[PDB]
Amino acid sequence: QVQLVQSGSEVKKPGSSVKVSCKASGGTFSTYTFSWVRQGLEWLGGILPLLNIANYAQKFQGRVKFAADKSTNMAYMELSGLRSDDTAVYYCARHSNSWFSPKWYFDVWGRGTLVTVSSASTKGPSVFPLAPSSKSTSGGTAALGCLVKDYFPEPVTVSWNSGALTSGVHTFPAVLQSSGLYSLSSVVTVPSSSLGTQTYICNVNHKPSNTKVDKKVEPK
Amino acid sequence: DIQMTQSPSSLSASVGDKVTLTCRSSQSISNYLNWYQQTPGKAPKVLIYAASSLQSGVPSRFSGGGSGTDFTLSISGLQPEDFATYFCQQSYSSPYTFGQGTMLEMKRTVAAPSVFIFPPSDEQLKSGTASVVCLLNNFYPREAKVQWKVDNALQSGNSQESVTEQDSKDSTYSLSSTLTLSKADYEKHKVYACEVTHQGLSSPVTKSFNR
Amino acid sequence: KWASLWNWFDITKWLWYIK
Numbered sequence: 257q258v259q260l261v262q263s264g265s266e267v268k269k270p271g272s273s274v275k276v277s278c279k280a281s282g283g284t285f286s287t288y289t290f291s292w293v294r295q296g297l298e299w300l301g302g303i304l305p306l307l308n309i310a311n312y313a314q315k316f317q318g319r320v321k322f323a324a325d326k327s328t329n330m331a332y333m334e335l336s337g338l339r340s341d342d343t344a345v346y347y348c349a350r351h352s353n354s355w356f357s358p359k360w361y362f363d364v365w366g367r368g369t370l371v372t373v374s375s376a377s378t379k380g381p382s383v384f385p386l387a388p389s390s391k392s393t394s395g396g397t398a399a400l401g402c403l404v405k406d407y408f409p410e411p412v413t414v415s416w417n418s419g420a421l422t423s424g425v426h427t428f429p430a431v432l433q434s435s436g437l438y439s440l441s442s443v444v445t446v447p448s449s450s451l452g453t454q455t456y457i458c459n460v461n462h463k464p465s466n467t468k469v470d471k472k473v474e475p476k
Numbered sequence: 477d478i479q480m481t482q483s484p485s486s487l488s489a490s491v492g493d494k495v496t497l498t499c500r501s502s503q504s505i506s507n508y509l510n511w512y513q514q515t516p517g518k519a520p521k522v523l524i525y526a527a528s529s530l531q532s533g534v535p536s537r538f539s540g541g542g543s544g545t546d547f548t549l550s551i552s553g554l555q556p557e558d559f560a561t562y563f564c565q566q567s568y569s570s571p572y573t574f575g576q577g578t579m580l581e582m583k584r585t586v587a588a589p590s591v592f593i594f595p596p597s598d599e600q601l602k603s604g605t606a607s608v609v610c611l612l613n614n615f616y617p618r619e620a621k622v623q624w625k626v627d628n629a630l631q632s633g634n635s636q637e638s639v640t641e642q643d644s645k646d647s648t649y650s651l652s653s654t655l656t657l658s659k660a661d662y663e664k665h666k667v668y669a670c671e672v673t674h675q676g677l678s679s680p681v682t683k684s685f686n687r
Numbered sequence: 688k689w690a691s692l693w694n695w696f697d698i699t700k701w702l703w704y705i706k
Contacts, residue, residue, distance in 0.1 A: 299571055324690065334688040354700045357526065359508045359525065360567050361522050366519065386609055391594075405600075426650045426652075428638040428652045429640070431654075433636065445613065
């Protein structure tokens with residue numbers, strides 16, 4: 257199974273450059289072509305490591321470069337002049353081999369590299385309780401949650417009761433605030449008869465900032 | 477230079493249904509046309525290439541057809557794992573362009589949301605800010621409207637909302653909306669309310685609290 | 688990076704052309 261292993265997530269300021277890496281695993285480059293596709297899906301360009309030739313989309317003229325190390329079976333794309341709208345997941349993808357047919361397709365994909373372009377620096381979230389009350393009950397069931405506010409960059413992981421609570425949990429996609437910082441919420445519906453007897457704790461991990469918070473959510 | 481257009485943008489269907497998705501190219505591209513499937517958090521995966529050839533391992537319920545400018549992908553007996561996003565892509569000429577995607581969602585009967593409201597926490601108020609959260613839980617269809625009111629005055633530009641993907645347990649959606657004010661503005665008002673409009677509600681529902 | 692950026696050389700179909 258020929259697979260593609262990609263380099264880790266990147267956070268870049270506007271006007272800088274980023275180099276994404278893609279390593280062929282379970283196989284070599286051989287005669288194949290490898291492209292980068294970001295995410296709507298958009299092809300940026302690709303490289304033929306065998307001959308050290310690259311193609312590019314005109315949209316990225318003067319902004320994109322490619323390289324490959326045949327010894328390590330690693331290919332690279334450098335994207336320069338970064339803009340906030342370059343924020344995307346960048347997939348490396350192998351083309352099917354044209355020796356069999358020119359009507360090619362992307363037959364192997366990497367897992368993607370998240371590239372965040374922003375003037376913000378890494379910041380851990382504040383975690384606030386969404387307390388259950390009579391305004392969060394619907395007859396036998398109560399709602400509670402945690403507001404995970406003002407962090408950068410993505411992602412954050414939220415668990416409830418260290419994983420002991422999974423049913424009824426909704427963790428929402430983050431929104432990007434006008435401040436350039438992210439915010440999300442995680443909620444759970446529980447039996448309202450459990451509020452005085454069961455402890456509810458939201459566990460929040462923001463690896464980019466080494467932030468780990470456990471917040472008890474109590475009624476008041 | 478070649479625009480790819482897909483229709484419909486979103487399709488609701490049931491397990492076992494037969495559906496046909498369409499892709500159109502702005503220029504003739506012979507049969508240099510590929511279909512990919514993508515589920516949230518995962519890279520796309522090819523299903524059909526050269527307009528009608530099935531990639532090894534792809535269930536035979538998938539088929540493709542077309543040559544020139546009009547192309548179709550048919551799923552004859554949708555299975556749960558087929559509820560995904562589908563992209564077409566031309567390999568005829570650079571730049572190699574993708575369609576915008578068709579998302580398949582699961583049908584269910586209309587479900588009204590349960591509405592909950594959360595005042596700001598004491599810990600956030602101490603920091604000088606106030607966020608109020610309104611939760612719409614387990615509703616269908618996805619279309620829903622939330623309107624923030626502060627002492628019955630309609631708010632705009634100070635809130636954001638997020639909607640979950642379709643829940644695999646019950647095929648519903650959930651929505652969270654956050655209204656954020658400074659502590660100073662928050663303490664000048666009393667009644668905070670979110671009003672919710674949805675097909676399952678005969679009339680809009682308001683959840684509120686007094687500061 | 689330093690591969691030759693030659694859009695006139697179709698890297699997606701060259702093997703088919705060269706047979």
